[PDB]
A and B are shown apart, each in its own frame.
Chain A
Amino acid sequence: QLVRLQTELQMCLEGSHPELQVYYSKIAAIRDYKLHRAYQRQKYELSCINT
């Protein structure tokens, strides 16, 4: 169990083991969402200044 646990620990501290890859496709969504909101803000603001 030492072999297995430290193999997973130093195979994970790079970023490849399952647990850290189940929280990374759950936070990239949050960042993508915030960025989409920023873009929509600017889109509405500029098309307001235009008119």
Chain B
Amino acid sequence: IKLCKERLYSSIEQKIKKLQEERLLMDVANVH
């Protein structure tokens, strides 16, 4: 159960990092 929970959480934190790079590109987009 430890491995399974933290594996799915690794996926959801790659989701949060998806949004990190999202706001990276919108960071340069506000620098525009």
- Which residues of A are at the interface with B, using a C-beta cutoff of 8 A? 1, 5, 9, 19-20, 23-24, 27
Contact = CB atoms under 8 A, between A and B. Distances in A.
Contacts, number: 11
Interface of B: 1, 4-5, 8, 12, 16, 19
A1 B8 CA distance: 20
Contacts of B12: 9
Chain A binding surface, main DSSP class: loop
Contacts of A1: 19
A20 B5 contact: yes
A24 B1 contact: yes
A23 B16 contact: no
8 contacts: A1-B19, A5-B16, A9-B12, A9-B16, A20-B5, A23-B4, A23-B5, A24-B1
